[PDB]
Design a protein around this ligand. Structure first.
Ligand code: NA
Ligand code: NA
Ligand SMILES: [Zn+2]
Ligand SMILES: [Zn+2]
Lengths: 57, 35
């Protein structure tokens, strides 16, 4: 899956995040600007998902 | 059986802000919404 921001492949050993607002693209965490701590908290919370800037705007 | 669930959708900005709130001891969790 190509990262929705940088176009490079989102690999298994990279922090990956899926847009669950609509587009269902994968992104590298780092490309989104999300902190590692925010990513850890969001991925641990079952009632919380992420939406990309495009789908949220 | 049939259920419905509310799922909160965070932008990057609001994910980062919610983490800051947790770190600052202001809320227990990133979905601890309040007044
Ligand atoms: Na989550
Ligand atoms: Na997500
Ligand atoms: Zn990327
Ligand atoms: Zn999206």
């Amino acid at each position: 899956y190509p990262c929705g921001i940088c176009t490079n492949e989102v690999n298994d050993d990279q922090d990956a995040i899926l847009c669950e607002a609509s587009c269902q693209k994968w992104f590298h965490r780092i490309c989104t600007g999300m902190t590692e701590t925010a990513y850890g908290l969001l991925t641990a919370e079952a009632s919380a998902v992420w939406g990309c800037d495009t789908c949220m705007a | 059986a049939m259920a419905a669930k509310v799922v909160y959708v965070f932008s990057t900005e609001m994910a980062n802000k919610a983490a800051e709130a947790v770190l600052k001891g202001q809320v227990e969790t990133i979905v601890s919404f309040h007044i």
